[PDB]
Amino acid sequence: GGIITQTPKFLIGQEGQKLTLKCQQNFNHDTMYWYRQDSGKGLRLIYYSYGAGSTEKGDLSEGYDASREKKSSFSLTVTSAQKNEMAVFLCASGSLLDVREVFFGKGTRLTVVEDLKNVFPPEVAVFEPSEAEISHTQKATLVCLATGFYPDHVELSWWVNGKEVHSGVCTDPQPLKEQPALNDSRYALSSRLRVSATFWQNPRNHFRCQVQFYGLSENDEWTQDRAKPVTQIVSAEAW
Amino acid sequence: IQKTPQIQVYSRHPPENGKPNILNCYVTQFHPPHIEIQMLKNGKKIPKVEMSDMSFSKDWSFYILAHTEFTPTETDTYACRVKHASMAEPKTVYWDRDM
Amino acid sequence: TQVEQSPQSLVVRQGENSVLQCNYSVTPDNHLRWFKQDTGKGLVSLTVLVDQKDKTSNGRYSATLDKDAKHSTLHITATLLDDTATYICVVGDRGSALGRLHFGAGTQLIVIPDIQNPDPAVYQLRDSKSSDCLFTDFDSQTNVSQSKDSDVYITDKCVLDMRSMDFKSNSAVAWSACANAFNNIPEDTFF
Amino acid sequence: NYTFRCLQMSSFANRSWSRTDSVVWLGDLQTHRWSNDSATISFTKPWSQGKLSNQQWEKLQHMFQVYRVSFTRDIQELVKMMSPKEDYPIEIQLSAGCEMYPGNASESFLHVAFQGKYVVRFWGTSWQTVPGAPSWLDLPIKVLNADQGTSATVQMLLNDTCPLFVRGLLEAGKSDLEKQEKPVAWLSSVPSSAHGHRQLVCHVSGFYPKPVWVMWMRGDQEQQGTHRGDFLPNADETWYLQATLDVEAGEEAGLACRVKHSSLGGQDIILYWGSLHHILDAQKMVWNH
Ligand SMILES: *[C@@H]1O[C@H](CO)[C@@H](O[C@@H]2O[C@H](CO)[C@@H](O)[C@H](O)[C@H]2NC(C)=O)[C@H](O)[C@H]1NC(C)=O
Ligand SMILES: *[C@@H]1O[C@H](CO)[C@@H](O)[C@H](O)[C@H]1NC(C)=O
Ligand SMILES: *[C@@H]1O[C@H](CO)[C@@H](O)[C@H](O)[C@H]1NC(C)=O
């Protein structure tokens, strides 16, 4: 009767930086876990615990330490972030009296960037449906374009009339590298919202493409000339 | 050590000097189960002591039988030396055929 | 590892049924379970199998377990687009919390939409707002290829679902010459 | 009549090191031996498989093999769980088996001891702590009782398998179980702690089965000061016992060590203290002390 939450969703690290991530759980579960999900491998246990003060090594412990301050909370620390690193970290909790009851959190995406300076927010622009489609199909697609962001730590959503919509929408599963040459190259992502032409023709309906970007925290101060690529929302509002 | 070993040394058959026999060393009542046992002819280790498998009894105390073929004589001494954690110094019990 | 899932990737038409395999060698084999993982998200429990010969079901998910063959099969009936997320098979070696879970590497399921009325057409934007293109309505057979040239970026095909309407359609976007993009198509195309 | 025992000794020294050794007994005859380094359960009698088929045995053996490595890990995890409540080193003893009665009446048991004290039994359908057991134990017990698989396996071994296997052992090993080996007796003595006194030792050895009667006599009368030592084993599966009386020096003449055993028919061994044979055997025993 609750949730298990991993903070943060996305993590920007540098080579050799200490790594910290939390996991909180309100199921009253004594057991808690830290797995690593590598592409094509499946979960490997890093650390686990039976309670506070208990941290037990799993098969993937080397390179990490973990601490359990209390029953509800379990932290994992990445001691030294690898130079090319890209990893997913999954937390799980379990009942001591029922092995089957095991719950997972939504995971944590880690991207190690070689230089801080590289980090950029996306530029968001909305495109109106081409008139040829309207007469042809009686349907109208808006196209949204997020461009020039690094790392691929984004959440794109569509908004009509002050509310989010999951119907008529498609977002690319895979972002595009703007310069496929150089690792850490900035990203581009496209999404589409398709509604009835009769719905679009009306200029009382407001259309908004919103992109949540996860960047630099206020925690780490930045010393470069232009605007700090912080965690921010950037949207294009087209009527 | 969990407890202290009791040691009893005795022969399989009646002792006849210069005649082949079997000498037993029965170690009981010791905890924990780790124990070092050796049988000695004139203070020196017998070459081939055979050990029964470690077992225990209803009261949970461990026991084990060491045994070897030996020939009794007038002057050859026989002993069973036990090394256990419940004892700072090893314990040596001499075979005495009369008791 | 000790848990093999097969195949690595599966393609099914929307509406059809899909089958996923899991083979294992772990011992003892107290229970086997199935997880759904959406892209950029956690593991969701589908069904848990415990008996020597067992059958379980949860909505459109059902599974069977053979203890004897150390084999398990997941079935999805009337596959939807939502079924896209990867599918993980897990075995637990104890009936107590002293146990350990052994994870399979998983199977990616790709659900192709059934395009009933294809109307291939390219549209031009415009390019809102204040600064100044979509290829859509193609069928399943058509697969988009990315530009060799650095200059133009082309996104892979994706499916939107107009639920209120009984409709679905594919679409790809390009930008940097609308009439010529992404050659590698069908001639039936608009303009 | 007969009790079947499976005895397990498990030792855990630290996180890395551990060994498990087991021995099986039928009455006081050893039927099996399972050493940590041995992958398989070793027969110690020709009839050790009882009446089970080759593959019936394997089903029994394979289940045990999986149990051995799973118990080892489960204990280690339990120590991890009891972070300061308990710690290595760890000594665990299991006694599991059957007591057979006439008519197929049979009683099963599985007892567990921790650091030498009896603490846990399997009872009915689950694990139980016994009176005087330490209180921290119950949580582990709860954790373990959530495993109905283990519970179902143990119930099968206790309720059905063990009474079945031992019925087969009692048949296939009847001759060994019912054998009669005769006691051999010999006399000796040492000085007593008390001045003017001797302790007379009657040694009785090589008898089977266990029950025996060993007493010092002056004619018909039985010397009440007779002390009977413990039953001590021989390596050839026979028993040894000694009875020691205390006498005033000079009172030895007239006395005899008397032995009753089932292997002797109705012919008790009466050993007279100063006999022709005692005189002769004593001469072959002389030593330098
Ligand atoms: C094995 O025998 C035991 C007892 O002989 C049965 O377990 C239970 O016994 C308790 C007493 O401890 C009773 O209260 C229960 O009613 C019994 N359980 C059940 C489910 O009826 C056990 O059932 C037997 N198991 C098998 C597999 O034969
Ligand atoms: C642990 O177990 C035994 C103690 O008897 C010892 O021989 C072994 O070397 C120990 N190892 C460590 C790492 O403590
Ligand atoms: C006992 O056996 C196990 C499995 O074969 C082994 O890993 C362990 O080291 C052994 N312990 C010893 C030899 O002390």
Check whether residue C105 and residue C27 sit in a common domain.
yes
Q: Is the Cβ of A56 closer than 8 Å to some Cβ of chain D? A: yes
Q: Which residues contact B12 (CB under 8 A, 6 or more apart)?
A: B21, B22, B23, B24, B67, D205, D206, D234, D235, D236, D240
Which amino acid belongs to residue C161?
A: D
Regarding chains B and C, contact by 3 or more CB pairs under 8 A is answered as no
Instruction: Residue B84: give its domain's CATH number.
Output: 2.60.40.10
Ligand 1 centroid to residue D95 C-alpha, Å: 20
Reference C173, options A71, D212, A172, A162; nearest CA is: A172
Q: List the domains of chain A with CATH numbers.
A: 1-114 (2.60.40.10), 115-239 (2.60.40.10)
Two tokens at C69?
């063959």
Domain boundaries, chain D: 1-178, 179-275
The first and second tokens of residue C77, run together, are 């009936």
Option in C27, C30, C98 nearest D149 (CB): C30
Which protein residue's CA is at the shortest distance from atom 9 of ligand 2?
Answer: D17
Cβ within 8 Å, pair C95-D78: no
CA distance C106 to chain A (A): 7
Main-chain phi, psi angles of A237, to 5 degrees? -105, 110
> Among partner residues C1, C42, C169, which is closest to A105 by beta-carbon distance?
C42
- What spacing in Å lies between the alpha carbon of D15 and ligand 2's midpoint? 8
Three-class secondary structure of residue D270 per DSSP: strand
Do C138 and C72 share a structural domain? no
Residues 6 or more apart whose Cβ sits within 8 Å of residue C9 = C107, C108, C109, C110
User: Is B in contact with D (3 or more beta carbon pairs below 8 Å)?
Assistant: yes
On whether both C100 and C119 belong to a single domain, the answer is no
Judged by its nearest atom, the ligand closest to the C-alpha of residue D158 is 1
Which residue has tokens 């909790």?
A93
Nearest CA to ligand 1 atom 4: D124
Tokens at residue A208, please? 């908004």
List the beta bridge partners of residue C73.
Answer: C21, C64
Question: Which protein residue's CA is at the shortest distance from atom 5 of ligand 3?
Answer: D37
By residue range, what is the domain housing residue B78? Answer: 1-99
In 3-state terms, what secondary structure has residue C31? strand
Residues forming a β-bridge with A78: A19, A64
C159 contact partners, CB below 8 Å, separation of at least 6? A170, C81, C113, C168, C169, C170
User: Mapped to the 3 state alphabet, what secondary structure does A79-134 carry?
Assistant: CCCCCCCEEEEEEEEEECCEEEEEEECCCEEEEECCCHHHCECCEEEEECCCHHHH
**CA A157 centroid distance within chain:** 13
Among C94, C113, C132, the domain-final residue is C113
Burial class of residue C59, CB neighbours in 10 A (0-12, 13-18, 19+): exposed
- Please check whether residue A125 touches C, CB under 8 A: yes
Residues 19-48 (C) with a CB less than 8 A from some CB of A:
30-31, 33, 35, 39-45, 48
* Closest approach of C98 to chain D, Cα-based (Å): 6
- Indicate if C16 and C49 belong to the same structural domain: yes
* Region at C34 (left for phi over 0; alpha for psi -120 to 50; beta for the rest): beta
CB contact under 8 A, D149 and C95: yes
Listed in sequence order, the residues at least 6 apart from C16 whose beta carbon sits closer than 8 Å to its beta carbon are: C78, C79
Residue D170 C-alpha, separation from nearest chain B C-alpha, in angstroms: 22
Q: To what resolution in angstroms was this structure determined? A: 2.5
Q: From the candidates A186, A190, A235, which should be mutated to test the interface with C, based on the most C CB atoms within 10 A?
A: A190
- Which of C113, C128, C161 lies at the terminal end of a domain, its last residue? C113
Q: Are strands C44-49 and C53-58 parallel, antiparallel or unpaired?
A: unpaired
Domain tally for chain B?
1
**Within the 78-97 window of chain C, which residues sit less than 8 Å (CB to CB) from chain A?**
88, 92, 94-97
Tell if the CB–CB gap between A99 and C155 is shorter than 8 Å: no
Tell me the best of D14, D90, D91 to mutate to test the pocket of ligand 2, counting ligand atoms within 8 Å of each CB and taking the most: D14
Tokens of D32: 């099996």
How many C-beta atoms lie closer than 10 Å to residue D104's C-beta?
8
Residue nearest to atom 12 of ligand 3 (CA): D19
Residue of D nearest to C30 (CA): D149
Interface residue A129 vs chain C (CB under 8 A): yes
Among C50, C94, C100, most D C-beta atoms within 10 A, so best to mutate, is C94
**Which residues of chain D does A56 touch, with a Cβ-Cβ cutoff of 8 Å?**
80
Q: Treating both helix axes as pointing N-terminal to C-terminal, what angle do D54-81 and D138-145 enclose, rounded to 10 degrees?
A: 140
SS3 at position A78? strand
Tell the CATH superfamily of the D179-275 domain: Immunoglobulins (2.60.40.10)
* Structural domains in chain C (count): 2
Chain D: residue whose CA lies nearest to A31: D81
Amino acid letter at A140? A
Query: C1 and C57 share a domain?
Result: yes
CA of A215 to the centre of ligand 3 (A): 51
**Which experimental technique did the depositors report for determining this structure?**
X-ray
Fold classification of D1-178 is 3.30.500
Looking at the DSSP bridge assignments, the partners of residue C174 are C154
Tokens read off for A19: 């790594």
Q: Which residues of D are part of a known binding site for a D-galactosylceramide?
A: 74, 147-150
Question: For residues D168 and D4, is the Cβ–Cβ distance under 8 A?
Answer: no
Pairwise CB contact (< 8 Å): C159 & A170: yes
What is the spatial distance between Cα B16 and Cα A62, in angstroms, rounded to a whole number?
68
Does C105 lie in the same domain as C11? Answer: yes
Ligand found nearest the CA of D65: 3
CA distance A216 to A58: 31
How many A from CA of D88 to the centre of ligand 2? Answer: 11
> Which residue range is the domain that position C1 belongs to?
1-113
Q: Name the residue of chain D whose CA is nearest to A96's CA.
A: D143
CA pair distance C36, C47, nearest whole angstrom: 10
Q: Whose CA is nearest to atom 2 of ligand 3?
A: D36
C40: CATH: 2.60.40.10
Q: Kind of pairing, strands D197-207 and D213-218?
A: unpaired
Beta-carbon contacts below 8 Å between C and D: 30
- Do residue D150 and residue C27 have CB atoms under 8 angstroms apart? no
Q: Which residue, C78, C113, C148, sits at the end of a domain? A: C113
Strands in chain D per DSSP E: 2-12, 18-26, 29-34, 42-43, 90-100, 106-114, 117-123, 126-129, 184-191, 197-207, 213-218, 221-222, 227-228, 232-233, 239-248, 255-260, 269-272
DSSP 8-state assignment for residue B43 = T
Give φ, ψ of D39 to 5 degrees.
-70, -30
C84 and C25 within one domain: yes
Instruction: Taking the CA atoms of D261, D267, D268 and D271 in sequence, report the sign of the dihedral they define.
Output: negative
Peptide bond into C7 cis (omega under 30): yes
DSSP tag of D135 = G
Please tell me which residue of chain C has the smallest CA distance to A167.
C162
Cβ atoms of D83 and A53 within 8 Å: the answer is yes
| Strand pairing class (C86-92; C101-103) | antiparallel
Cβ atoms B37, B84 nearer than 8 A? no
Beta bridge partners of D203: D186, D242
Nearest Cβ partner of C27 from D66, D147, D150? D66
Same domain, C16 and C52: yes
Q: How far apart are CA D248 and CA D200, in angstroms?
A: 10
Rounded-to-integer distance, Cα D50 and Cα D29, Å: 14
